Amino acid sequence: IVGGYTCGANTVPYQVSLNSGYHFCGGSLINSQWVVSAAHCYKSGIQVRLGEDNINVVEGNEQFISASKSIVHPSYNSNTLNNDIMLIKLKSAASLNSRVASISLPTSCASAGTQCLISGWGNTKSSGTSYPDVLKCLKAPILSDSSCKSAYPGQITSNMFCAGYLEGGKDSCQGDSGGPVVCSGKLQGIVSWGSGCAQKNKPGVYTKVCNYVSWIKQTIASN
Numbered sequence: 001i002v003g004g005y006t007c008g009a010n011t012v013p014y015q016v017s018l019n020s021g022y023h024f025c026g027g028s029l030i031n032s033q034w035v036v037s038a039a040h041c042y043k044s045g046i047q048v049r050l051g052e053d054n055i056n057v058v059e060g061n062e063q064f065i066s067a068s069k070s071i072v073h074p075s076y077n078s079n080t081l082n083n084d085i086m087l088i089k090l091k092s093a094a095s096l097n098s099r100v101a102s103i104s105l106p107t108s109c110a111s112a113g114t115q116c117l118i119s120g121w122g123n124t125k126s127s128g129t130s131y132p133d134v135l136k137c138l139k140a141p142i143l144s145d146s147s148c149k150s151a152y153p154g155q156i157t158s159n160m161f162c163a164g165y166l167e168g169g170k171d172s173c174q175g176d177s178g179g180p181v182v183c184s185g186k187l188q189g190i191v192s193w194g195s196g197c198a199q200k201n202k203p204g205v206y207t208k209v210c211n212y213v214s215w216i217k218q219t220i221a222s223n
């Protein structure tokens with residue numbers, strides 16, 4: 001997260017870290033057994049880490065649970081990042097508490113102009129490279145689809161939306177991938193892609209979760 005703020009320990013209780021010997025992506029806990037992340041975060045041997053603040057220090061509230069399966073969206077296209085969503089099932093159910101909690105799926109899509117909360121342990125520099133210890137947060141508005149398409153001509157599908165600041169300076173970044181975009185207490189986006197981070201006229205592009213609720217519910221009902 002570039003240009004954001006320190007969230008505060010366990011204030012984003014649905015935020016997860018995906019670990020394969022190191023943190024590589026974020027995710028969102030949607031119930032005791034399932035995490036929503038980005039399909040481009042797929043790899044084998046994922047361990048889900050819940051209740052994290054400092055990802056490099058065991059502070060006492062963590063739950064580390066191995067993934068039993070990963071399900072990439074059937075229409076995920078890794079070239080265009082269309083349908084950039086994946087479900088990860090935990091080997092055992094998480095214990096839900098104040099520090100580890102699920103985030104609601106939306107019943108309707110979010111509105112242009114709505115301020116959303118984006119979070120992660122990704123790069124905090126728009127140019128160089130610096131990774132934070134503690135979870136970082138950013139409040140950013142959903143942009144109009146016409147501004148989004150103008151920013152990224154020929155690349156924005158109906159399964160994507162832009163959020164952020166066209167002036168640059170504030171954005172999600174590498175290492176935030178797969179993490180939550182929460183708007184009005186619902187999981188509306190997944191950190192997906194963008195040209196660099198926090199660049200002028202290049203806002204963040206996010207998977208449009210409201211399009212996938214049917215697939216999510218069907219998949220979790222059968223796996």
Ligand SMILES: N=C(N)c1ccc(/C=N/OCC(=O)O)cc1
Binds near residue numbers: 171174191197204
């Ligand atoms: N909002 C952005 N500008 C943005 C968001 C996500 C990415 C994802 N990069 O994938 C590589 C990785 O996370 O390791 C890039 C730019």
Ligand SMILES: [Ca+2]
Binds near residue numbers: 054056057058062
């Ligand atoms: Ca920790």
